[PDB]
């Protein structure tokens, strides 16, 4: 014999988006290349690097990325041309 | 104006000898008189504040400001956005003009008068008064007034303690 149970009403979750570092420290990069995919301002951009529509960090010039500390707690990302 | 002359001539010297101030411009000074209307509106009639505004512009010398409610509370059926209360600040020669009218004509014209409250202070040299009647100076056209809600009077000085404001307001002319 059996007993009937159901109604979990929990089984859904969205398709998870790729977020994170897509270039490493010291990488040569190209003009227009993304460096970090964040969601909200985790890292403020520095020189030669912009901020996208959905807070994306993109390299304006081809160069070498460097990650640095900004202030007490925050990070900064920058591009140095070679 | 007259009060400014007396304050410059005698009030401030007397109290600066009395508190023995090293710098003579440490003298307490009355900074702002603000008059705040409050209507128990709650969507009963729009014209209550729409009467109090031009009543207060006759009481003072210029137009007041319709205050904005901060947040809604249904305990009065107060929806946020519809206007409640009025305010106007007075300074310059205007403040001494209003305090002149107050001491000269207004408090003697109250229906019953005993001495002003002993300890209506903030604790830090400011004073607040509550009067129940609009009959402040007799050339308000008293026949046109309908509602009886009086006025709220806030004088702000540079007093840091209560005692200096308490003593200075005596020679200003507040009975106690």
């Amino acid at each position: 014999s059996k007993k009937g149970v159901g109604s979990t009403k929990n089984g859904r979750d969205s398709e998870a988006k790729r977020l994170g570092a897509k270039r490493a420290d010291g990488q040569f990069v190209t003009g227009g290349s993304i460096l970090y995919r964040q969601r909200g301002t985790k890292i403020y951009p520095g020189e030669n690097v912009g901020r996208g529509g959905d807070d994306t960090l993109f390299a304006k010039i081809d160069g070498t990325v460097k990650f640095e500390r900004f202030g007490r707690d925050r990070k900064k990302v920058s591009v140095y041309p070679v | 104006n007259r009060l400014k002359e007396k304050y410059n001539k005698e009030i401030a010297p007397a109290l600066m000898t009395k508190f023995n101030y090293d710098s003579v411009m440490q003298v307490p000074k009355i900074e702002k008189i603000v008059i705040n209307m409050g209507v128990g509106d709650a969507v009963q009639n729009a014209k209550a504040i729409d009467s109090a505004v031009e009543e207060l512009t006759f009481i003072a010398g210029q137009k007041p400001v319709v205050t904005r409610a901060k947040k809604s509370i249904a305990g009065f059926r107060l929806r946020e956005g519809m206007p409640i209360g009025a305010k106007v600040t007075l300074r310059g020669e205007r403040m001494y003009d209003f305090l002149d009218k107050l001491i000269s004509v207004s408090l003697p014209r109250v229906r019953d008068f005993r001495g002003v409250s002993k300890k209506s202070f903030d604790g830090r040299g400011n004073y607040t008064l509550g009067i129940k009647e609009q009959l402040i100076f007799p050339e308000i056209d008293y026949d046109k007034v309908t509602k009886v809600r009086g006025m709220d009077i806030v004088i702000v000085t540079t007093a840091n303690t209560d005692e200096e404001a308490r003593e200075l307001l005596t020679q200003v002319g507040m009975p106690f």
């Binding site: 059996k2 007993k3 149970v5 159901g6 109604s7 979990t8 929990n10 | -």
Partner: protein, 135 residues
């Protein structure tokens, strides 16, 4: 029957218990306490029965302490069902006792009656225990 009067979520994982106790290792408030020397779960029925066996024998001796609250719920599926199709309903409250934790603290009581009384309360628990006194 130590009920947490409100709880954030009603179903957490059972978790795993590794290593020694985080805090409350030694006697702090009373003079003599009882310490557990291996890991297991502990539930409100046990804690209440232990406090009865402690305090009712102890009568007017002094006062007692508990430094364990069975905050974490544990669930169970209803009896005789096929497993699966949603987590079961919660039915009880449990606490973790990592080895090294002191269980109960005794106060205002001489050493030997507290000794035998903690020994009596030990059998209510499902764990191997050790007497520890204050330094």
């Amino acid at each position: 029957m130590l009920l947490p009067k409100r709880v954030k979520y009603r179903r957490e994982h059972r978790g795993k218990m590794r290593g020694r106790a985080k805090g409350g290792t030694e006697v702090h408030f009373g003079e003599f306490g009882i310490q557990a020397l291996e890991a297991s779960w502990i539930t409100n029925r046990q804690i209440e029965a232990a406090r009865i066996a402690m305090t009712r024998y102890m009568k007017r001796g002094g006062k007692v302490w508990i430094k364990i609250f069975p905050s974490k719920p544990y669930t169970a599926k209803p009896l005789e069902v096929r497993m699966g199709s949603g987590k079961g309903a919660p039915e009880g409250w449990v606490a973790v006792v990592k080895p090294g934790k002191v269980l109960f603290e005794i106060s205002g009581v001489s050493e030997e009656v507290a000794r035998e009384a903690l020994r009596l309360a030990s059998h209510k628990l499902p764990i191997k225990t050790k007497f520890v006194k204050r330094e």
